[PDB]
Design a protein around this ligand. Structure first.
Ligand SMILES: OC[C@H]1O[C@@H](c2nnc(-c3ccc(C(F)(F)F)cc3)[nH]2)[C@H](O)[C@@H](O)[C@@H]1O
Ligand SMILES: OC[C@H]1O[C@@H](c2nnc(-c3ccc(C(F)(F)F)cc3)[nH]2)[C@H](O)[C@@H](O)[C@@H]1O
Ligand SMILES: O=c1[nH]cnc2c1ncn2[C@@H]1O[C@@H](COP(=O)(O)O)[C@@H](O)[C@H]1O
Ligand SMILES: O=c1[nH]cnc2c1ncn2[C@@H]1O[C@@H](COP(=O)(O)O)[C@@H](O)[C@H]1O
Ligand SMILES: *Cc1c(COP(=O)(O)O)cnc(C)c1O
Ligand SMILES: *Cc1c(COP(=O)(O)O)cnc(C)c1O
Lengths: 810, 810
């Protein structure tokens, strides 16, 4: 059908058909007379998987023979989504599988919808890890992703009576055809115990053992025949565990609970023992695998020449003291040599500056669970502070600020301080965020070791986030500039030469229109909801958090509603305002924001005076496969965090690539996006970081905005008085109280500028040719935001390896 | 190599080699350079499995089209052992797989040893269910085995310091290539709740739901292209289960613990809630499947013409009230019609008369867990006792004896009484056992409904227990009489014409000798132990229980030891006495018996005066795959239960088929074995049932035997005084005390006759030609003990279906 989906050759199609029928019979044990759509999906998945395996074996054999430097990306989260379509894209099999299935009487798009997301992350951080794996493979790096195979990933969100309910995401129920269990490479992980000092060093004894069993998933690069590995660890009890008899067997669950469930918080730290066990479990199993692979090539001086460990936030920070433990206690290196090796091996990426998100573990927990690690952390601390004292003598307050050990009611270890001390590189995730790290929270560290601090602006893979989700757009681009842009996204700059081309303008607008129709119909079938596809699709999808300011969007929607009710016969540009995202289960205010959004919808969507001019929809169960559907259909991307809070954002970049315009603050990567496109091609509003600081110094008084802005005062009076909750008139009083007296994110301070900027959006939308021209200018300058760019920078500036676009033989 | 293993055709061997290499690459994702023996085993298993699937699909399609009466064999235990070799035997692929693997540089026998037993049973009862599945398939019956897929089967036994230790049998760790998960046929099972009475009948409401997910395993018949199904249910929590958040997900284990572990008791009832949940779980899921399959062909009058349910002991007895629940509460049949259907559908097999083995559930447990079932049981009871009262008017004591409800401190339900009332057939498992049921424990029921009571003597499959485990014997038999005996074991009677044939006598003795050498070497490699293969191999393998009288064997071993020490220079026929079996974890006396056996070994095996004349070995971890090794190597089979306690036995039959002579009491099937072979060809000793009854009437006084038999008194004095436990002289005092004052199984009363009979064994062993002649007379008359005979009798006399030896097309 479309060129970028590859060739459908007669021999290839014939072979796929044969192998599909072979898997249906032999693998699935079904005949066509009782096979269901799910059986057909599995038969296709097994057929596609078979094309990966020769490449996977050969790639891994190649790394064994050439012995390149190996990159280990350690994360507690990998938000992979579905695999079937991405596999087909990266192996150039999409058109052939389409034709094969078509000839068998099946619709491949319907089969694709049966696959479960692999939802092993919360949002941005997990999804960045997934984009990064795709880019590392595409760039030919000998890279491994290491994590935990959660039995239950991020919960499925149901909305009942306008409230979030959570249900377990039993994603493995039907089986996962993409993973291969490797029970033969199972490794022991130790917990609790105590430390004994011999004449021969420290010994960690009387520990409880849990086994780490690996499951390997292939990670195909884009058309280069490279297939890298994501190795995820699952917890198993040893067979003598607890070994009346029946109870001892049932108690194996205590050990196996380590890998049972993903902690569903985004940007929030909960200091629970189970989470600490998860963190150590992933680090201890991974480090043994790394060392094994290093020894199979005494001499640890070469370790950092052969190994890079990238820490995805502080979550795997125990890698630093574990590496030291192994080197000092087991391999018998002297401390100073072990430390040199550790620092050269490890690098740390910071993803947040919000203080409630930073990991600070109580000492009493580490003392019980990981006594040898606590000893090592104290020794790191004393040696590090000795360096501080020599560089800034007499600066006692700096010694307290920089310590890894925080004093207080409860002593805690600051894991970010540990990561900085133990890493040769520390980076933020967008230019403004990296600057904030050097000026504020890590200022003291930057003064001590300025060379360590870098920036690596985030990106997204253009395989999943253009070719897979928006083939119509990919195709019209390819018609003009060829296909090379899919792995060299800077080539999109060539589209600036088309910005006055009438045929290109028409085709861009047509693709958006098709995507909107297809999304409007998806909504009707799966959720009984009726939208106007001619309306401006105004979309805010991301996790629910006060800093992301879904509430500011709510205030704008109400403002529009109230303006209509005041002048019902005046023309306004029709909108469908779509908001979606999950709230963490214990985050009360986030759950209340969901309820407010649905309650606004209950009023607006049923008011006959409004008609089809304004619709407010809460998109349920936002997840990677939903993002693939809604992002191509969006006109307006809402990126409206308070300046200084969103470290980068990555949703922002997905919308840009897919032909939405952005309304946003100068926060995170929005800054760089506006710089690349031109500020004239972006809807920027609100306080800059410097303005937020100026307000914090004076003191934020929300009452002043309420007193001066009558439209704002009306909304607050409606919320307080029960207008949006007539049966429970006080339902929203916690929201009102927060906005008026304890708003850390200054919602009211950006209200006026936001509403005015939204009127400029509406004005441009009335002129479709100029709207579309501005869209072309955004798509054309989105190249910087490829994760291939990001990864090449990590490779060159941090890991010391060269990317390659060269193919392995097929 | 050998004829009974089938043809190794060039095309077949070529195809097996191709498919092996294809599974190694695509299925296992390994190349030959790093494949281990376990990878080779899996590649072979997948290769063999592929030959089952077409036959499985076609068989199940055939039953759908022809709609025969379906047989459902419901058991809490299926002791399957390994599958690879049995599959190859039944598909006639053994020689071809041998040749294929040989050409690939691999030893198939070594690969076979990697497979884990499927140990989903305790002993005889579970293994009978497995033999029965094999026979049902071989006889062309549309039969299904239904059970529970335990995550942990019977524990692995380790001996440490002479004591049993238990370790979890994590049999699924490496995966099970034989099963197919069927998550699509998942069904709900209800627990707890309460009953509400409407105008429209009773409703069971407010229940907790657990899901039953089926896993299907193929069951190949012998060379007939029939492949039946064993469907095993696994417990899963629903996704809204318990739905702070983290704890709710972790608490899913409470539901999933139902299928976690096999209760490891043999012939003992433990009234625990978890076991009752297991019993209902298997019955509730199975009955829904049965009804579904019946409706897919309103009219329940035809149900018993299309369905037979066989209850393997009382463990699935809740099938009776569940069927009534479904028919009355859900399908709205009147009680009397529902009861008629139930009784015609259900049949019950009793496997024990020991009172501590009988299930008697406390009413308070049923009331909480299964309130509607308790109501139905009470109504069954009142209607049943109304019949009793009409047939035996004024016999009030009979009403109390026959009630399903036992009065007492705690009221209990007698499940055996429930099974009799609700079944159209009740059988025992050997002729003497069926007679005992009619004369003693079920006398009252027999008087009321004599037509219900039958006998079905047990059997064993000659596929696993001759062809697979003893190919050398199978081959020498086939050379003389052909191969038809493998599915018509009565043909072994033709071997009586060879009993004076010098070549046949030589070949029988040669095969036994080879089997003994091969076993003696197995012992050296895997367990560092050194035996004389010229010695008489005297073997008692079975679960450890006081009624089985391993202690009587111990007294004989000590007697022999003491006789040697008294006259060290006299010739005695050399023996290797091998005892093995598992003890239930909470059964203290059974654990003490193990320790005594090992302690006897510690003395006997290290006494230089004894030399190689007497060795006592405890065979660790006795299980199906160990039975396949030791049974062909045995000379003397010890079947020495107190008369009236072993309902049948089946080990007995395996030894007979494999060329051992039997020393035994007239108990269980030993009676029928001696009748078939001739009493002159069996070493019978000890009290008959009638003699045991006569002693119980007078009162058993063990002291009288101690006072009269000096050899016996010496052994007791050695046990008491610390001769076998010099560091802990009182270690055996509980054993001594039991034997002298509280022995329910009358060990001392059979001692003298047992020792005398053992001297006759030794005398015959000195004359190898006459020993071997007697062996031929046993093998030749073992045909009755085929489970094919047993199953044909169930089919004709209970189920109302005709067996077939006809092939489905290949
Ligand atoms: O760099 C990838 C993305 O990371 C996001 C990001 N930062 N911290 C997080 C984060 C995620 C989970 C957890 C927790 F609780 F431990 F599970 C803690 C912190 N996620 C940023 O908000 C987001 O701005 C950024 O684009
Ligand atoms: O019929 C098959 C075999 O069944 C054996 C047999 N009888 N009862 C049992 C038996 C097994 C397990 C359980 C329990 F505890 F529930 F798990 C309870 C009872 N096993 C006989 O001892 C044995 O004599 C007979 O050959
Ligand atoms: O001893 C060896 N001989 C040959 N190849 C090896 C050996 N060890 C590792 N390899 C290769 O590299 C491996 C990749 O596994 P890893 O050690 O888990 O990275 C195998 O799949 C082989 O292809
Ligand atoms: O509706 C049907 N059409 C055709 N075959 C069926 C149908 N229902 C059941 N079968 C056949 O019998 C089934 C056996 O599955 P069961 O219902 O679990 O016994 C399938 O594998 C089919 O071969
Ligand atoms: C990209 C993405 C995110 C991150 O979106 P932000 O707007 O940057 O927070 C979160 N969730 C899903 C499912 C995503 O695809
Ligand atoms: C046959 C068998 C049994 C039953 O043996 P009995 O002597 O009849 O009790 C027990 N366990 C295993 C492993 C068997 O193969």
């Amino acid at each position: 059908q479309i060129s970028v989906r590859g060739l459908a050759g007669v021999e290839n199609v014939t072979e796929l058909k044969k192998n599909f029928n072979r898997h249906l019979h032999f693998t699935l044990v079904k005949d066509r007379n009782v096979a269901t759509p799910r059986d057909y999906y599995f038969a296709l998945a097994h057929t596609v998987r078979d094309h990966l395996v020769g490449r996977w074996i050969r790639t891994q054999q190649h790394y064994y023979e050439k012995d390149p430097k190996r990159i280990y990306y350690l994360s507690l989260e990998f938000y992979m989504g579905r695999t079937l379509q991405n596999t087909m894209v990266n192996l150039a099999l999409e058109n052939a599988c389409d034709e094969a299935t078509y000839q068998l009487g099946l619709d491949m798009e319907e089969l694709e919808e049966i696959e479960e997301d692999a939802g092993l992350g919360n949002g941005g951080l997990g999804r960045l890890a997934a984009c990064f794996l795709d880019s590392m493979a595409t760039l030919g790096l000998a890279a491994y992703g290491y994590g935990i195979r959660y039995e239950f990933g991020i919960f499925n969100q149901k909305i009942c009576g306008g409230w979030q309910m959570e249900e377990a995401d039993d994603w493995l129920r039907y089986g996962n055809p993409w993973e291969k269990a490797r029970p033969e490479f199972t490794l022991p992980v130790h917990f609790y115990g105590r430390v004994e000092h011999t004449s021969q060093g420290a010994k960690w004894v009387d520990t409880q053992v849990v086994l780490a069993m690996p499951y390997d998933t292939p990670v195909p690069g884009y058309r280069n025949n490279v297939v890298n590995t994501m190795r995820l660890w699952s917890a198993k009890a040893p067979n003598d565990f607890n070994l009346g008899y029946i109870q001892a067997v049932l108690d194996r669950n205590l050990a196996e609970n380590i890998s049972r469930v993903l902690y569903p918080n985004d940007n929030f730290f909960e200091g629970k023992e189970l989470r600490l066990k998860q963190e150590y479990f992933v680090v201890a199993a991974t480090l043994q695998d790394i060392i094994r692979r290093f020894k199979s090539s005494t001499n640890f001086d070469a370790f950092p020449d052969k190994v890079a460990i990238q820490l995805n936030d502080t979550h795997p920070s125990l890698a630093i003291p574990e590496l030291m433990r192994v080197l000092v206690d087991l391999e018998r290196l002297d401390w100073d040599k072990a430390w040199e090796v550790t620092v050269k091996t490890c690098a740390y990426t910071n993803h947040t500056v919000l203080p409630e998100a930073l990991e600070r573990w109580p000492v009493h927990l580490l003392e019980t669970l990981l006594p040898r690690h606590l000893q090592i952390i104290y020794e790191i601390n004393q040696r590090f502070l000795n360096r501080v004292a020599a560089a800034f003598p007499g600066d006692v307050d700096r010694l307290r600020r920089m310590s890894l050990v925080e004093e207080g009611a409860v002593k805690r270890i600051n894991m970010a301080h540990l990561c900085i001390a133990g890493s040769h590189a520390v980076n933020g995730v967008a230019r403004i965020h990296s600057e904030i790290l050097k000026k504020t929270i890590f200022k003291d560290f930057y003064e001590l070791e300025p060379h360590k601090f870098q920036n690596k602006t985030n990106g997204i893979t253009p395989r999943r986030w253009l070719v897979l989700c928006n083939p119509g757009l990919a195709e019209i681009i390819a018609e003009r500039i060829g296909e090379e842009y899919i792995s060299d996204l800077d080539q999109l700059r060539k589209l600036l030469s088309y910005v006055d081309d009438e045929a290109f303008i028409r085709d861009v607008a047509k693709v958006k229109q098709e995507n909107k129709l297809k999304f409007a119909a998806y909504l009707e079938r799966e959720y009984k909801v009726h939208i106007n596809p001619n309306s401006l699709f105004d979309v805010q999808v991301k996790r629910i958090h006060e800093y992301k300011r879904q509430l500011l969007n709510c205030l704008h929607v109400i403002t529009l509603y109230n303006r209509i009710k005041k002048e019902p016969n005046k023309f306004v540009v029709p909108r469908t305002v779509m908001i979606g995202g999950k709230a963490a289960p214990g985050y009360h205010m986030a759950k209340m924001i969901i309820k407010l959004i649905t309650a606004i919808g209950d009023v607006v969507n049923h008011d006959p005076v409004v008609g089809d001019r304004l619709r407010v929809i809460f998109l349920e169960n936002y997840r990677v496969s939903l993002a693939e559907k809604v992002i191509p259909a969006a006109d307006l991307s809402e990126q409206i965090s308070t300046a200084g809070t969103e470290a980068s954002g990555t949703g922002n970049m997905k919308f840009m690539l897919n032909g939405a315009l952005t309304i946003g603050t100068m926060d995170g990567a929005n800054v760089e996006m506006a710089e690349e496109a031109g500020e004239e091609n972006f809807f920027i509003f609100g306080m800059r970081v410097e303005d937020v600081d100026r307000l914090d110094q004076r003191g934020y008084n929300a009452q002043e905005y309420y007193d001066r802005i009558p439209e704002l005062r009306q909304i607050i009076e409606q919320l307080s008085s029960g207008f949006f909750s007539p049966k429970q008139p006080d339902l929203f009083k916690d929201i009102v109280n927060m906005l008026m007296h304890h708003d850390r994110f200054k919602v009211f301070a950006d209200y006026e500028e936001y509403v005015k900027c939204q009127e400029r959006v509406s004005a441009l939308y009335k002129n479709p040719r100029e709207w579309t021209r501005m869209v072309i200018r955004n798509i054309a300058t989105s190249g910087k935001f490829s994760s291939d760019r990001t990864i090449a920078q990590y490779a060159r500036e941090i890991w010391g390896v060269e990317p390659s676009r060269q193919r392995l033989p097929a």
